[PDB]
Amino acid sequence: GTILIDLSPDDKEFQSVEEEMQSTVREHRDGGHAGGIFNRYNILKIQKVCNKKLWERYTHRRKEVSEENHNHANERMLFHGSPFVNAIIHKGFDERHAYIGGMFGAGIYFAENSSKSNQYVYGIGGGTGCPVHKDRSCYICHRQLLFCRVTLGKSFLQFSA
């Protein structure tokens, strides 16, 4: 059911997604161990993910949350990095995409900082880095992230280091 539509770099939609990707890079406390050493990206492609069944599953849940929270879905656009990006875009997010050992329990994690999600592209802590060179800071290999529409609803605030 999933089709991928390439956005033109001339499209304002490409440009606004690129700007969120680039402008939310930060330095990480691991000195680049997990995700690599970089201040910016070379964006190679941005594709819209179109799947009507997955979209309807999302909007159905969004209305449920919204109705439980004074008609406020508290919807955000957030980054997600994962080795399972190909399964996610075809079958949707589910329990197999959860970070069992995450700081806030076994759930599906998203970040405002694209560079935070970049640390998870090759696995937890960057795993062993890219398949080809085993380099977590590979500058050659193509990486993929998701920029996702996320319903937060009523969110539990955890202050944390």
Binding site: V17, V49, D94, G153, Q158, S160
Partner: protein, 47 residues
């Protein structure tokens, strides 16, 4: 997966040490996210 805290639909991890970090978020139901954009990229070596 775990459940959301009672009466909540997600968790927000607010950074409390690193002043420059943005928030991270957790959902406990896959149906609460849609993967809108697939971005293909490289990280760039600093000059």
């Amino acid at each position: 997966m775990a459940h959301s805290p009672p009466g909540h639909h997600s968790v927000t991890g607010r950074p409390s040490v690193n002043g420059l970090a943005l928030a991270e978020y957790v959902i406990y139901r896959g149906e609460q996210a849609y993967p809108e954009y697939l971005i293909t990229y490289q990280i760039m070596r600093p000059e």
